[PDB]
Amino acid sequence: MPQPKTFGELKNLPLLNTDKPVQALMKIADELGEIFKFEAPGRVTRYLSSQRLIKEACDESRFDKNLSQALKFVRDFFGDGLFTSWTHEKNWKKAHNILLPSFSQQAMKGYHAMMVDIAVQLVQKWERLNADEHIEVPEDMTRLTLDTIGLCGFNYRFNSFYRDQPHPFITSMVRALDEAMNKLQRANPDDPAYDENKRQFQEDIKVMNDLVDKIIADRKASGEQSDDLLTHMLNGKDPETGEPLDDENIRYQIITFLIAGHETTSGLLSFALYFLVKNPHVLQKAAEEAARVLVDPVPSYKQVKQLKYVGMVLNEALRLWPTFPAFSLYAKEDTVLGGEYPLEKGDELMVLIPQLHRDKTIWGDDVEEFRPERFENPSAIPQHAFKPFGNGQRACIGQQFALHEATLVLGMMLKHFDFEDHTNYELDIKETLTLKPEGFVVKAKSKKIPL
């Protein structure tokens, strides 16, 4: 099995001593091919990049979701919430059953008005800019997505469009995530030189948990009938066990959904706008759809569902830069991968999604081009070829929520503004376990259509 360059003792671990480890792993995959072994002191994983192998890795009878070293580190604040639980922990299937109805078609229709509330605030912010003012794209997308999960999920207003600096929750979240990613390359993690990285980590976790405390208090003291995600956390009973979630798990779910429910969607929106301004004919086509479909002062649920090409734009952004770029699996039993690589029970795999999405045998030779038309007919895509939301019963519970929000917001953006790649931005992808453009700015000229 191919393996990248080694450093003695340290095997491959120093290759992760970079601020952009996923992009480093993509370059190694380009050099070595569909599979390569990656060793660190005391741990081994196999990175997969071809649909040929990943389709086998996605066979749930043979492989289950693994908690990578990264996920074990963030389990310090995510606990046994849905994202950082093993499939076999009792709280995983319990919470899965209790929370899945919060993502039904009926539930999604119920979120729509509150999604519009935040989307209108974004559109108003940009409409109120003066001439020559820049838009800081990932920053405003993070304002939008954080506020949206807060309102729709928890009837809580972060009011991020009322701040010029990031919300304190965001600052701590980013530092906690970046600390976890930085802890993966530490050859000796208990070295005393990291003892205030460890101080800072615990302070950031307390910041997040204090916010969780307020959301729970506000719900407790609220004289308004909510039927949202938090209602189901606090009241729903698992049909199989008949049990509700306990208080400690509820706290972990709130942190999990606040983070998971906004960060990757902010990345997606930022990548989508980047590719639109870099591809003016695609932008024109999407804008024509937005103008043709969005005929009312605010979008309806059904109109968002009719934004077909906008949806294709988003899937093509997720193809090139899936914002949660890798997921981990382990072998449930001894097995052979691809007729060629024997695995023992417990062996770990890493699915490198950006490389899967560049498999030329699936997509053709032009895999670096931004062409939403690849998604004209979703049924033409082979099984396990396009996996931005993970796999099987451990796939993303929020996929439809993210895509509805992103389609709504991008539709309104395209209806209301012309965009300019004002600074000829050179793509710079920041990594914090998730992917996002850094430093991406545009200018937006209003088409002066009232809200």
Ligand code: HEM
């Ligand atoms: C474009 C946006 C998003 C992307 C790319 C994305 C991606 C993913 C991926 C790849 C996984 C599987 C992780 C693994 O196998 O270890 C996942 C799981 C999950 N996602 Fe998302 N996600 C997005 C939006 C959301 C939203 C909006 C929510 C909540 C409203 C959410 C909540 C979750 C949860 C709770 C899980 C764990 C599900 C389980 O294992 O039971 N995500 N997501």
Ligand SMILES: N#Cc1cc([N+](=O)[O-])ccc1O
């Ligand atoms: N989704 C999703 C997701 C995103 C993040 N994240 O953005 O950090 C963490 C955990 C998750 O399950």
Ligand code: NI
């Ligand atoms: Ni309900």
